[PDB]
Amino acid sequence: VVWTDFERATIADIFSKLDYEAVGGATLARCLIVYPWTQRYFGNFGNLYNAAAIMGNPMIAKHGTTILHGLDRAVKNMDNIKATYAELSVLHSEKLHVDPDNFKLLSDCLTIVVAAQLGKAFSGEVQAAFQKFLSVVVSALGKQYH
């Protein structure tokens, strides 16, 4: 990837405004409620029940937070994302066999949580740089052929 100066700055700026625990927990719970099939990958968390059970799930909040810190790792290594995610790629493809549509479903939920928080500050241009970042991420998480 090659990053524009604008792209590099707004990525750093977005993450600097997110409470990782707050946004992580909210993101993963959103994904598990809007796209219930994704629950299957997290069989050992707790309640496959109501949205309320997902919403108060402490294991879900925990893991949501872990995802955000994993994203922060890419933000700290913007020109070296593929290698930075090499072991996470092995985990998520080779071991867990996460259908890669799921990376996009989760990314889309993150985008919508960020949008809601940031408001009019989350302009088309800001969304463009965020989306390019998530594309780079999801590409480095997916099966590595190359």
């Binding site: 409620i33 809007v34 949205a51 889309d108 985008t111 949008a115 940031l118 009019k120 989350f122 088309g124």
Partner: protein
């Protein structure tokens, strides 16, 4: 298929966004074109793809109009959107892969403006609505 609770949530939102709808449509289209430049080829016949630009403004109105039709036809989107389906298949020939892109940009634009409406259960209803929309517009492709 949308439940009657999904339908009521969608109609509730549609009522809330009344004064802002034409502007929601224009901004959502602006997002599509900048975030997903793939889609720019369908609007080559424009001049200035910024929101607030006259063509994007007026076409935003038109999209939000098709979505209002969809709301009126929420009980059978397949039948209600058949002419719009035919249009997007044969006159304009639009890759159906793009319907999900525009739906996402609409949900993103709505989130920036009405974030309080984006509870997880509401988002689920809206996402089911725009998925069924997209699937209705896909009906006439083959």
């Amino acid at each position: 298929s949308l439940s009657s609770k999904d339908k009521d949530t969608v109609k509730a939102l549609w009522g809330k966004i009344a004064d802002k709808a034409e502007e929601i449509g224009s901004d959502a289209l602006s997002r599509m074109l900048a975030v997903y430049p793939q889609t720019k080829t369908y609007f080559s016949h424009w001049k200035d793809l910024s929101p607030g630009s006259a063509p994007v403004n007026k076409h935003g109105k038109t999209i939000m109009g098709g979505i209002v039709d969809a709301v009126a036809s929420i009980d059978d989107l397949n039948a209600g959107l058949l002419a719009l389906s035919e249009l997007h298949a044969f006159t304009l020939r639009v890759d159906p892969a793009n319907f999900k892109i525009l739906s996402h940009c609409i949900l993103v634009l709505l989130a920036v403006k009405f974030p309080k409406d984006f509870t997880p259960e509401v988002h689920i209803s809206y996402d089911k609505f725009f998925s069924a929309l997209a699937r209705a517009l896909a009906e006439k492709y083959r």
